[PDB]
Symmetry: D2
Subunit: 120 residues, 4 copies
Amino acid sequence: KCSLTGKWTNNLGSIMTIRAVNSRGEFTGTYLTAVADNPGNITLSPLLGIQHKRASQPTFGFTVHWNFSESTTVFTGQCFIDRNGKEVLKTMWLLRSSVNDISYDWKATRVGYNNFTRLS
Amino acid sequence: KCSLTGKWTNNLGSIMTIRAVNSRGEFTGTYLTAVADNPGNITLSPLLGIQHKRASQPTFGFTVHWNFSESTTVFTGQCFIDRNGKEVLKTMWLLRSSVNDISYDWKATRVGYNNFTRLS
Amino acid sequence: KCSLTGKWTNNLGSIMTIRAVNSRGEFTGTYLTAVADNPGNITLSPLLGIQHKRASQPTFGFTVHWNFSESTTVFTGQCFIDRNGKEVLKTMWLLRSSVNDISYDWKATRVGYNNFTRLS
Amino acid sequence: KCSLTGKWTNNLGSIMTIRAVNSRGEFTGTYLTAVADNPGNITLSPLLGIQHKRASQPTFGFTVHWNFSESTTVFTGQCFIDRNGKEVLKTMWLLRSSVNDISYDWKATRVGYNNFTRLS
Ligand SMILES: O=C(O)CCCC[C@@H]1SC[C@@H]2NC(=O)N[C@@H]21
Ligand SMILES: O=C(O)CCCC[C@@H]1SC[C@@H]2NC(=O)N[C@@H]21
Ligand SMILES: O=C(O)CCCC[C@@H]1SC[C@@H]2NC(=O)N[C@@H]21
Ligand SMILES: O=C(O)CCCC[C@@H]1SC[C@@H]2NC(=O)N[C@@H]21
């Protein structure tokens, strides 16, 4: 069974650390992004999410509340286990920026991908 | 100040309730989707997320762990307040399906929008 | 049968004209966005796309080459007709910005929706 | 200057062939996807798009009209040139399925990425 607990890195070099997954599938953790709109401001930021519990290759989602900007990212994906037991998270994300008013909403959401593997 | 705690409906007819937002911006709630891949299976599903606390029109994200499928959705957006104090959540979402192995990952993520308004 | 040829407006106030659709489903047209990163620079921009021909409610895609920035948008969606013969294009888009090198690629793609109705 | 003319493969193994880019940046080509909802049906399919012309690392978009389904995909991205002259297309895509009526629109759009490099 793939659990999100542990430390992961992604293809951009970001690191996240996920704590214990509870019996509902909820987890917390931290996220250190390698990149940002203003990378001189980056600080470690909290995440909160839910994975499925029964599945060996669960889907999941989490939210990162950036501690250094007004933005928020959500990630969703699936944990896959290889025939050799190696785990990969395949994800996609939406990065929501804060805009001044509803007339600017159209420009507020970026999209992308990230592949994660275990640090150790 | 635009608040997330309370009862919301979206443009598809789905409803959600969001409980008290704590000092870290974290919240839980319950989501009733009006639509699904298999709508005869729909059950109430928990959500867990984080909003920004200081901002009057905060960005936020949350995860919905569907209790009736192997899928997961994440929503991100911003809470706007107009001149008369009417709130709207402008959101975008990613809906992740479970696929059998990594070679099917390409097809696993749907995207869309939802505009939420306060029930009553 | 839902036709794309003609003049459309979307929920942001943008307008487009689409010319005759050929036997292969290919079409050209002109797009006037109501919004931009630098709205003082907006000029009319060409579009080029393909729809399905046989379907009464065809899917389609088109590219807009912005004539006033280095960005490009793609739209995809479906043309629906209701009981009274009213057409709507339900679309989603990706807006690609130019970045300096591949290390900035992660931030280069915005996503959103647009609903179009026929002008007159 | 990166021109999209030539043959490319992506990370899923798909192949596309792009013909001459005209002075407006328009191009046609063909796309042989490695994967599909029903891979037993895959046939070579046409594409039509636009790239920017002046830029050495242009943004672009194109539409693929699948010749074996009612779906359409759009891709947008940028062509990057390395310090060694090697070219990569970084893209993201929206895959629009045909649904029966507007009430199913919410489930009709998949999203993903693709990285392309030159065949030869
Ligand atoms: O720029 C900000 O204000 C917040 C940081 C955003 C970093 C994004 S989240 C999606 C992508 N994946 C990462 O690991 N980092 C970037
Ligand atoms: O179909 C499933 O297995 C889970 C339900 C998915 C419902 C989606 S989430 C995005 C969109 N917004 C809604 O309120 N419902 C749909
Ligand atoms: O800002 C630019 O440089 C180009 C204009 C982008 C306008 C976008 S495309 C998606 C959305 N829908 C519209 O009608 N306009 C915006
Ligand atoms: O399944 C279909 O009806 C049409 C084929 C879709 C193939 C998609 S397009 C996005 C992704 N990238 C590829 O090279 N192939 C898949």
